[PDB]
């Protein structure tokens, strides 16, 4: 019953390799980038005189106003 | 006793309505109806408790067959063990409550008084209190208190009631069936 | 008549008086239960039935001694005093019989000359001189066989060594050794001789009567009779002056003594009516103490405790021995019951030791619990006056100045403002400003831009040329005071200070000077706002502090704290914290010595068991609690003495006292938790209640293994939950199946065998 | 009877029954129950929680656990001893 | 019907299996 | 997740962990049989609520 320790050490080596390999897939800027893009759009209101954003669209003219004002504002700052 | 007290309160309260008559004489004064409100509150409390106990009294008559007799026997046979274990459980409960009161009781407002500590610890059992204040109060002893309380009163101490109750039910059913089989 | 009055002056309820009378009753109840359990065994032992030998001692003194008679032996000595024997056997003193007796007498006499033998002539005079039974040594070797072989009148005694020849030396010495530890009611519950009609259970009733009557009679004088001398508050020194406390105790004891005398005289020589009167007297004394103690200034409760303690020592060291001396001048299962009695006596001693320790702990923790509801309201009021919601939302935008000028200054210098206990202050620690740390994807809380703090004496601006010294100097930490576990790191009491006080119409000038002449920028690691509160209405201080951290050079981190504490000083006399610290230190020393005795009486290799670790943890907590309380008491006096000198000019930073005053309260409340847990497991001494601890102890490895399995299965599920896009024990009770099997097993193991 | 005019969860009898069913799940306020009646308000909550979670909900489990084992042993004995 | 009747049928099975397994293991190890 | 689950094989051969693993493997058939019954009623309630 010595192969049990061999299997144990091999599995621990595998687990330590895999834990590092999966911690390398938890970058900070993969989630924060999405969270900041989903707020740059979808939260900024229409150009002016309205408070409704994309998340709370209510009519067709609201969609047209979002396309004109807010979409053409967040895409281009002043790639 | 409670019914006599309620009857006495009702007779005493409704026999002195001189304030209403005095107000109805001259209606530019201040109507003094505070004593009547206080006595109405007290009468409501007494009546509610009396009704609850009268409804509890109904267990005295539901023993009409075997399936209810065994349940009553089981309930009245494990009371001796549950009373013995509840003393230990509540000693530990109060030991936790006093510690929470003396440590967190200055700056939480959930442990500000002994009663508040007891009620907060009952609400933790329901999974209703969540650690948001004990952290900012003490970032080191709050986690320790919460983790240790949850471990020693969910995983260990709260399941010792169920063991006692289950074993008592099993033994009562077993020996009742044995007696029935042998005698009859 | 002016002496005794009903004060009812103040509603400030006092807990020292009720906590002392609430322990002397639980102690009495538990000790009464133990003594009743001991009585049940003792009565049977006495109604049923080694300094000698157990050889075949059939007596051949002579014939002509035919009578059924019984003899008795008094083998007195060093703490041993045996009784007479029975009359049982085969012949049972038949015609021309012998004499031999080897009874299971636990009284192990010493190697001294104290023995008497009484022979009763049940019938005609025998012509056989029944000398004695021979015994040399079987178990302890404390026997001497030298008989006289005489024959006196019916029921006559004979005394040797190991009619009326002497009266005042023999008839008296027989009572200073028999009644000295029997009439002394304090050490009487342990050494009651058998076949006595005093039962050892009403002795405890008289003892508790003495304790409660002492407490009541002292509480009457302290609180009711306060005009005969004019002492309570004016000249009453907390410390014993040999006339202020001990005299009152002695007088109270002598005054109350001839009620205990009557109750005992009704108990003894009564072969009750006093068993109810004693309880009535205890109840009324406790009620009187509780009703009068609600008006004690905090410096008089310690005097009352010392007086009551003195009283007890009087009724223990000179009033009971006087009584007994005056009375003298006026006149196979055996080895199991022995173990039972030996264990019960140890239980009795441990109960009193534990109950004294518990009382000391309770007075140490809840001694001043009336100032625990005021602290919460005080800190809440301080926080709501300072608008403690805008400050916690302050980010770095050069915007703490409007907050300071809007809410702080009116609070400090208002007409209806706080006493404030001096002027506030600001601090500054820093060096080498951050080089604009990276904005994108900021660190959550690990913003620790490594650097270093300055120390040089700079001048107004940021240059210190030939202007001398440095003006905007760096006050070196004062040491042993404060640290502020800030988010960034661990700050200290050093830095650059600004007065910012002195008649607000002037403080605006300082505020604008700090704003305009380039003070708070370009390093900016701390500001450390800090002031102090004092509320004379309840008597609490408060160490208000506020700090701003600048870890990313453009964003701020706010943290405030208010810590209401009571200012207790060592120079304020023998205050209650000092007493409960010097008693806790003695208790810790006693426990440590007891542990060392076991360490050296059992030897090494006692590690890896819970007893030693538990004892050392208890000693550590006791010794830490007492020391921390003493440190707080010392620091509070040091800071006050420093503050008095230069009252309107310094700051004195009372935060270090507030930290110790909370550490000492958090330590003395965890020791009491351990004490209250230790009482829960003592329910095992009841017959059918001993299974709960056993089933919670045997079923621990299985629960721990289940917890390990759930931890593994939970970390795996957590790792799946993350990365994918971004209970099993509580509800379905699966611990009720592991504890129940053990409960059933250990319960069947207790009844069937 | 005690909270029937102040708490809005005990305004009617049906509301009382549904609130008491929801208390078992762990869905309470208790900030209005206590201030509606400082005495007899906490007593109701504490005694209800104790007599329901500790003693009364631990009996259905006992009944079912006993009956399942009895049935299992009965069937195993009937099949094996045939 | 899902907290009093159907979540007590899970621990019932688990308890019965635990009891029989422990009894078999005890009568096996302690006997040999 | 499966790699982490495979860890049980290396801690199941313990003195007190080998009475809970066998317990949870001897009743797998009964647990599946109970789960089917539970899910049928759960889905019936879900459809009624829908």
From Swiss-Prot, chain C:
Top-level lineage group: Eukaryota
Topological domains annotated Extracellular: 222-246, 297-298, 364-578, 634-661
Glycosylation sites noted in the Swiss-Prot or TrEMBL record: 415, 467, 522
Localization annotation: Cell membrane; Cell projection, Cilium; Endoplasmic reticulum; Golgi apparatus
Outcome of swapping residue 318 to S: In PKD1; uncertain significance
Transmembrane spans: 15-35, 201-221, 247-267, 276-296, 299-319, 343-363, 579-599, 613-633, 662-682, 705-725, 727-743
Side of membrane Cytoplasmic, spans: 36-200, 600-612, 683-704
PTM: N-glycosylated. Cleavage at the GPS region occurs through a cis-autoproteolytic mechanism involving an ester-intermediate via N-O acyl rearrangement. This process takes place in the early secretory pathway, depends on initial N-glycosylation, and requires the REJ domain. There is evidence that cleavage at GPS region is incomplete. Uncleaved and cleaved products may have different functions in vivo.
Variant or mutagenesis effect after changing residue 71 to M: In PKD1; uncertain significance
Impact noted for substituting residue 170 to H: In PKD1; uncertain significance
Consequence recorded when altering residue 403 to S: In PKD1; uncertain significance
Annotated domain remarks: The LDL-receptor class A domain is atypical; the potential calcium-binding site is missing.
Subunit structure: Component of the heterotetrameric polycystin channel complex with PKD2; the tetramer contains one PKD1 chain and three PKD2 chains. Interacts with PKD2; the interaction is required for ciliary localization. Interacts with PKD2L1. Interacts with PRKX; involved in differentiation and controlled morphogenesis of the kidney. Interacts (via extracellular domain) with WNT3A, WNT4, WNT5A and WNT9B. Interacts with DVL1 and DVL2. Interacts with NPHP1 (via SH3 domain). Interacts with BBS1, BBS4, BBS5 and TTC8. Interacts with RGS7.
Function according to Swiss-Prot or TrEMBL: Component of a heteromeric calcium-permeable ion channel formed by PKD1 and PKD2 that is activated by interaction between PKD1 and a Wnt family member, such as WNT3A and WNT9B. Both PKD1 and PKD2 are required for channel activity. Involved in renal tubulogenesis. Involved in fluid-flow mechanosensation by the primary cilium in renal epithelium. Acts as a regulator of cilium length, together with PKD2. The dynamic control of cilium length is essential in the regulation of mechanotransductive signaling.
Name of the protein this chain belongs to: Polycystin-1
Organism per entry: Homo sapiens (Human)
Gene name, Swiss-Prot/TrEMBL: PKD1
Swiss-Prot record, chain F:
Tissue distribution of the protein: Detected in fetal and adult kidney. Detected at the thick ascending limb of the loop of Henle, at distal tubules, including the distal convoluted tubule and cortical collecting tubules, with weak staining of the collecting duct. Detected on placenta syncytiotrophoblasts (at protein level). Strongly expressed in ovary, fetal and adult kidney, testis, and small intestine. Not detected in peripheral leukocytes.
PTM (free text): Phosphorylated. Phosphorylation is important for protein function; a mutant that lacks the N-terminal phosphorylation sites cannot complement a zebrafish pkd2-deficient mutant. PKD-mediated phosphorylation at the C-terminus regulates its function in the release of Ca(2+) stores from the endoplasmic reticulum.
Family (UniProt): Belongs to the polycystin family.
Transmembrane segments annotated in the record for this chain: 32-50
Parts of the chain on the Cytoplasmic side: 8-31
Record's subunit section: Homotetramer. Component of the heterotetrameric polycystin channel complex with PKD1; the tetramer contains one PKD1 chain and three PKD2 chains. Isoform 1 interacts with PKD1 while isoform 3 does not. Interacts with PKD1L1; probably forms a Ca(2+) channel. Interacts with CD2AP. Interacts with HAX1. Interacts with NEK8. Part of a complex containing AKAP5, ADCY5, ADCY6 and PDE4C. Interacts (via C-terminus) with TRPV4 (via C-terminus).
Subcellular location, record wording: Cell projection, Cilium membrane; Endoplasmic reticulum membrane; Cell membrane; Basolateral cell membrane
Species lineage: Eukaryota, Metazoa, Chordata, Craniata, Vertebrata
Reported effect, residue 38 to A/I: No effect on channel activation
The protein, known as: Polycystin-2
Associated disorder: Polycystic kidney disease 2 with or without polycystic liver disease: An autosomal dominant disorder characterized by progressive formation and enlargement of cysts in both kidneys, typically leading to end-stage renal disease in adult life. Cysts also occurs in the liver and other organs. It represents approximately 15% of the cases of autosomal dominant polycystic kidney disease. PKD2 is clinically milder than PKD1 but it has a deleterious impact on overall life expectancy.
Purpose of the protein: Forms a nonselective cation channel. Can function as a homotetrameric ion channel or can form heteromer with PKD1. Displays distinct function depending on its subcellular localization and regulation by its binding partners. In primary cilium functions as a cation channel, with a preference for monovalent cations over divalent cations that allows K(+), Na(+) and Ca(2+) influx, with low selectivity for Ca(2+). Involved in fluid-flow mechanosensation by the primary cilium in renal epithelium. In the endoplasmic reticulum, likely functions as a K(+) channel to facilitate Ca(2+) release.
């Amino acid at each position: 019953l010595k192969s049990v320790l061999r299997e144990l050490v091999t599995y621990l080596l595998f687990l330590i390799v895999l834990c590092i390999l999966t911690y390398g897939m938890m970058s900070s800027n993969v989630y924060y980038y999405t969270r900041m893009m989903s707020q740059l759009f979808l939260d900024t209101p229409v150009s002016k005189t309205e408070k409704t954003n994309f998340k709370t669209l209510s009519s067709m003219e609201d969609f047209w106003k979002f396309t004109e004002g807010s979409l053409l504002d967040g895409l281009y700052w002043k790639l | 006793v409670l019914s006599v007290v309620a009857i006495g309160i009702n007779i005493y309260r409704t026999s002195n309505v001189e304030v209403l008559l005095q107000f109805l004489e001259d209606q530019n004064t201040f109507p003094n109806f505070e004593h009547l409100a206080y006595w109405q509150i007290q009468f409501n409390n007494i009546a509610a408790v009396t009704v609850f106990f009268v409804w509890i009294k109904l267990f005295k008559f539901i023993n009409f067959n075997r399936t209810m007799s065994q349940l009553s026997t089981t309930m009245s046979r494990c009371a001796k063990d549950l009373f013995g274990f509840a003393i230990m459980f509540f000693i530990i409960f109060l030991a936790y409550a006093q510690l929470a009161y003396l440590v967190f009781g200055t700056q939480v407002d959930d442990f500000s008084t002994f009663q508040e500590c007891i009620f907060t610890q009952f609400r933790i059992i329901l999974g209703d209190i969540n650690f948001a204040e004990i952290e900012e109060a003490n970032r080191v002893l709050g986690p320790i208190y919460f983790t240790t309380f949850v471990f020693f009163m969910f995983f260990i101490l709260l399941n010792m009631f169920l063991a006692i109750i289950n074993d008592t039910y099993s033994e009562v059913k077993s020996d009742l069936a044995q007696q029935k089989a042998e005698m009859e | 008549h002016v002496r005794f009055v009903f004060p009812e002056p103040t509603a400030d309820v006092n807990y020292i008086v009720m906590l002392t009378c609430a322990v002397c009753l639980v102690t009495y109840m538990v000790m009464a239960a133990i003594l009743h359990k001991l009585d049940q065994l003792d009565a049977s032992r006495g109604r049923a039935i080694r300094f000698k030998y157990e050889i075949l001692v059939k007596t051949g003194w002579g014939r002509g001694s035919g009578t059924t008679a019984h003899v008795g032996i008094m083998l007195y000595g060093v703490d041993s005093r045996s009784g007479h024997r029975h009359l049982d056997g085969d012949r049972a003193f038949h015609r021309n019989s012998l004499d031999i007796f080897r009874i299971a007498t636990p009284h192990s006499l010493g190697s001294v000359w104290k023995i008497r033998v009484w022979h009763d002539n049940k019938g005609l005079s025998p012509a056989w001189f029944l000398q004695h039974v021979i015994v040399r040594d079987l178990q302890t070797a404390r026997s001497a066989f030298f008989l006289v072989n005489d024959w006196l009148s019916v029921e006559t005694e004979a005394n040797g060594g190991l009619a009326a020849l002497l009266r005042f030396r023999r008839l008296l010495v027989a009572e200073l050794q028999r009644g000295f530890f029997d009439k002394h009611i304090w050490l009487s519950i342990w050494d009651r001789p058998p076949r006595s009609r005093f039962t050892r259970i009403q002795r405890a009733t008289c003892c508790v009567l003495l304790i409660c009557l002492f407490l009541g009679a002292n509480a009457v004088w302290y609180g009711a009779v306060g005009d005969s001398a004019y002492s309570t508050g004016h000249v009453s020194r907390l410390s014993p002056l040999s006339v202020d406390t001990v005299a009152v105790g002695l007088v109270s004891s002598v005054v109350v003594y001839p009620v205990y005398l009557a109750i005992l005289f009704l108990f003894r020589m009564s072969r009750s009516l006093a068993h109810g009167l004693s309880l009535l007297l205890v109840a009324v004394a406790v009620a009187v103490s509780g009703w009068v103690g609600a008006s004690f200034p905090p410096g008089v409760s310690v005097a009352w405790l010392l007086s009551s303690s003195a009283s007890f020592l009087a009724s223990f060291l000179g009033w009971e021995p006087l009584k007994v001396l005056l009375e003298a001048l006026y006149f196979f299962l055996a080895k199991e019951e022995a173990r039972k009695v030996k264990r019960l006596h140890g239980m009795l001693r441990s109960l009193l030791v534990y109950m004294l320790f518990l009382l000391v702990t309770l007075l140490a923790s809840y001694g001043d619990a009336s100032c625990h509801g005021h602290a919460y309201r005080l800190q809440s009021a301080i926080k709501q006056e300072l608008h403690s919601r805008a400050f916690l939302a302050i980010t770095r935008s050069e915007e703490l100045w409007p907050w300071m000028a809007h809410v702080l200054l009116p609070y400090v210098h208002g007409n209806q403002s706080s006493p404030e206990l001096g002027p506030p202050r600001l601090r500054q620690v820093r060096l080498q400003e951050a080089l604009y740390p990276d904005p994108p994807g900021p660190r959550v809380h690990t913003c620790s831009a490594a650097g270093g703090f300055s120390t040089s004496d700079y001048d107004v601006g940021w240059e210190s040329p030939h202007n001398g010294s440095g003006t905007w100097a760096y006050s070196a930490p004062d040491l042993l005071g404060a640290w502020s576990w800030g988010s960034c790191a661990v700050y200290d009491s050093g830095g650059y200070v600004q007065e910012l006080g002195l008649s607000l119409e002037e403080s605006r000038d300082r505020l604008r000077f700090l704003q305009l002449h380039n003070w708070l920028d370009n390093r900016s690691r701390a500001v450390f706002l800090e002031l102090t509160r004092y509320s004379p209405a309840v008597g609490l201080h408060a160490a208000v502090t506020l700090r701003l951290e600048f870890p990313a050079a453009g964003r701020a981190l706010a943290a405030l704290s208010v810590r209401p504490f009571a200012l207790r000083r060592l120079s304020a006399g023998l205050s209650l914290p000092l007493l409960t610290s010097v008693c806790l230190l003695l208790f810790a020393v006693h426990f440590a010595v007891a542990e060392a005795r076991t360490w050296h009486r059992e030897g090494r290799w006692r590690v890896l068991r819970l007893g030693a670790w538990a004892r050392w943890l208890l000693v550590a907590l006791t010794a830490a609690t007492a020391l921390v309380r003493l440190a707080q008491l010392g620091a509070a006096d040091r800071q006050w003495t420093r503050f008095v000198r230069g009252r309107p000019r310094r700051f004195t930073s009372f935060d270090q006292v507030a930290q110790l005053s909370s550490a000492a309260r958090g330590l003395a409340a965890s020791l009491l938790f351990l004490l209250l847990v230790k009482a829960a497991q003592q329910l095992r001494f009841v017959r059918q209640w001993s299974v709960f601890g056993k089933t919670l102890c045997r079923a621990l490895p299985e629960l721990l293994g289940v917890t390990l399995g759930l931890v593994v299965l939970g970390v795996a599920y957590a790792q799946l939950a993350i990365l994918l896009v971004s209970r099993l024990w509580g509800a379905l009770r699966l611990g009720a199946v592991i504890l129940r099997w053990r409960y059933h097993a250990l319960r069947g193991e207790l009844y069937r065998p």
